Amino acid sequence: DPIADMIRSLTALQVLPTAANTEASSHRLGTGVVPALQAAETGASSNASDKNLIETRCVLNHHSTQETAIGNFFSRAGLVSIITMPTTGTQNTDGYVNWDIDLMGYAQLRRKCELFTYMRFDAEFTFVVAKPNGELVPQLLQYMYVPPGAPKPTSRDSFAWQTATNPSVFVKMTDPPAQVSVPFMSPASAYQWFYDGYPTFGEHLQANDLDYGQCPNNMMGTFSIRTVGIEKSPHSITLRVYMRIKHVRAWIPRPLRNQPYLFKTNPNYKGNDIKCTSTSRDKITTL
Amino acid sequence: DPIADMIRSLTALQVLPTAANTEASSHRLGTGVVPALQAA
Amino acid sequence: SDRVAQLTIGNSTITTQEAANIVIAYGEWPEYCPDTDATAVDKPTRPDVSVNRFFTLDTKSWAKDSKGWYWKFPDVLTEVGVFGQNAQFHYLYRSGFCVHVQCNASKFHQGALLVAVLPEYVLGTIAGGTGNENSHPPYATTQPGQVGAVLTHPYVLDAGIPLSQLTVCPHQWINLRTNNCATIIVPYMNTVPFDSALNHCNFGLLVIPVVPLDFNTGATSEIPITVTIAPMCAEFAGLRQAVKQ
Amino acid sequence: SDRVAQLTIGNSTITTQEAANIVIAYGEWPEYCPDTDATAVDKPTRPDVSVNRFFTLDTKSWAKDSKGWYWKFPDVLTEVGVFGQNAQFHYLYRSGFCVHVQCNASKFHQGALLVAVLPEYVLGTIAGGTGNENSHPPYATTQPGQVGAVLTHPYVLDAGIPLSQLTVCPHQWINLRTNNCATIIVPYMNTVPFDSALNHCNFGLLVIPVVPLDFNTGATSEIPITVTIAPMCAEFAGLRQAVKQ
Amino acid sequence: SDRVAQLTIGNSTITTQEAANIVIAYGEWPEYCPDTDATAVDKPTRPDVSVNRFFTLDTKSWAKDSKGWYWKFPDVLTEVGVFGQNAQFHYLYRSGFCVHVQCNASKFHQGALLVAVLPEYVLGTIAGGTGNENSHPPYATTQPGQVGAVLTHPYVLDAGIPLSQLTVCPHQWINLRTNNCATIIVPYMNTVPFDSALNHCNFGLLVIPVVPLDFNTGATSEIPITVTIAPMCAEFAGLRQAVKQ
């Protein structure tokens, strides 16, 4: 009272089940009005439509817009991991495997997710398992989810497999593929495929520049698997993991990856061979 | 009906028996108005 | 009446007689964090005019062969004025920005800069050329400070993505024959309500000459580009001693 | 708001950012022939969009010494697109026209073209110089086709009449320091409701440089002039086989 | 709509397409002398259109080194047209003025003239340099006629006063990149209702180049300055024979 100085979004949602119609138009001849002329410098895309540039007929368009809803674009199971437990070799003659959950190892799904900066969703995981040649044998397996901070099994018979609190699934290689629903688990409000920053404070000496881009809010822990038995199993095992996004929301679209992927954790690209987004031709005046 | 797309002279005559009259006028000093300037 | 404009905030005012409108990123004005979204319980400090004002950074020179530059936010201001001081003394920070990029020439010069804001601008390396080396960008490249940095491969934005599609982000163009500045208002974007102004850069500002500068010899050749930015609705929390990084 | 304009007809659109209004010849818009005036009894064909659209003819080059050009209507289009085809297959034709002449230069060039429409533009010969020879213009001169022709004596419009008085006809000027185009809308004018598009040219379009082109050497010297025309309310009757002349 | 203007008075009209508004000295329009203020008893003559019209005086040439000029009122017109004749035949005179100073260049020239009206512009001499000589200006300097005179020391307006403060008087600037004329309307100012047009000059018009003319060689170098003035509400009294001084 005795000190006076101490006293939004202009756009929203519409439902568009079908493509816009075309209204019939005729010739327009005059000064002042000029819809064909634009100013791309503004940052806006052109507002001109067919009826302003030509004479149109009427078209009652019933083409649906439903299949391009992000939900239908993403809710299709895709491969996010291939885990192997061979019986001979340097791989894992141990009968168990601990896999750090990182889904950025396969391009098809990755490129689709990276179209957005942030995504929030639930997921359906399907586990397709078989011998490396595709054959199936009566082998009992156990898949266990080990959240960050939970003891990781150190052997085929580590106490951790008691799985008294962690969720585990027991299934036979002969049963259909196991399948479960997973909720949204980040401590953040959304998973983020791009984090322009460092996870901790400190000097960022070239020794720990591998910290750059690592967002802890996306680190979901470990996925462990073993043949259920005190003795070694005679079978090599191939586990393919598929993920299906559901109940999804996405924010901030970005340019799509146009260089092959090199690493799971960063956007590094092969500098000696930078691919052009479009194929080439000889002359700009010839097809 | 099922196909929508299937659906003059700004000057005329006056009688002028006599030449136009001349109305008295005074000085006009100002911006914006400029009758002497044309665009042939 | 759309080409003329004035921006006044704090004790600072910007004017322009050759604008091309103003962009409001994703259609949203910056705003202080609301109680429903907040999580940190301490009452924040909202300095107002001492930090929500225009700061002008170092100027760059546009040459017929420039590749393009970029700056990270809030990195650019972590060490400038009262804003920087608040960013250092607090763990938590949050704000929006008004970005005003300036560049004027003459009716006889030509060229076009694309001015864009790219949220979470994560950079990549050329992987030792062959692609067998998993190298990473050094601090100085990811957080160049107020001087900004230079793009080595603008075509892929030093991140394996096409410049051709950057217009999918909030942007404007400075086309010398049309305007002499770009203005973009950016709201806070993140997966958390507040964050560290030191460890995380919310977005990057890119200024790339897509249509190269050109002019007949005899015409002024020093054509600078200047960046002036203003935090909006700056809020801070988690007070303690000052930390630079 | 009088200097800017857009013309859209058929599947074609013209734009101009330096116009000087639009002329409607004798104050009348073209219109289809009404039943009171008509005489031919067959139902005509009115193709609409396939013929009432903009056609761009061959471009001419304006030189410091050009005399001027002219085109005859409907001759120019008798062999172009669907319009020409209809003109050939029918004995009777009738239509109006929208004429748009284009010519842009720079703020450093100068000159002025007079763009006019002269109904029943009958040409004459210089009569063997002495005037004792009753010579006549050859087909190629009276009906030059889409390429148009050149005036040999613009001062008398190759017809014994003063160019100085041509402004008594519908016209506009293209004065380089002011505009870069001329637009004239012409209604059907004739002593009969319909006529042959082959034997009779309703009017001629003249483009004469009354104030010669000039510019300092070093400036662009190729200053073209382009003619784009659109039939309006084209109607045809008396169908039979195609005839070219 | 503030840059364009037309002034019509008497049988004369002025046009300008690059004005910068119009000044009404001290906010007052000229007016004939009212009966309360008047003192002379004879009915005055108010010629109207024969004297309240625009008169154009001799033109001056602006050079990169010009010092500036000045004219005295009503001296400039005492021998021009019907106004001068009336000023000579009458003892008493009174009027206001519309002053229009013209100067156009090109978008490539630069410079700025200060155009001002200074009531009772009394001139001084440089006092023999040392200041020991009490010299005075000769008639030709105090009343230069229609040709006007040149300032020898513009900085002190040849009168011991600072040019820097002349803007405290009714004025406008002709800044070549902005406008090409100045217009000031001046009301009668004096300690008496009427006065001699010969013995007393009510005010002086100063045109001083405060920001010197400049341009690259090759550009037009003859940049004239023209003064056109119009008496307003001219009234005269005390008729007798003609007197020139």
Ligand SMILES: CCCCCCCCCCCCC/C=C\[C@H](O)[C@H](N)CO
């Ligand atoms: C018993 C079956 C357990 C199955 C548990 C699977 C949990 C996986 C949750 C999906 C988390 C989304 C992926 C998150 C982050 C990305 O991988 C990051 N790029 C890693 O840095």
Ligand SMILES: [Cl-]
């Ligand atoms: Cl067990």
Ligand SMILES: [Cl-]
């Ligand atoms: Cl590049």
Ligand SMILES: [Cl-]
């Ligand atoms: Cl001739």
Ligand SMILES: [Cl-]
């Ligand atoms: Cl001086």
Ligand SMILES: [K+]
């Ligand atoms: K629809």
Ligand SMILES: [K+]
């Ligand atoms: K009359």
Ligand code: NA
């Ligand atoms: Na438009």
Ligand code: NA
């Ligand atoms: Na006018």
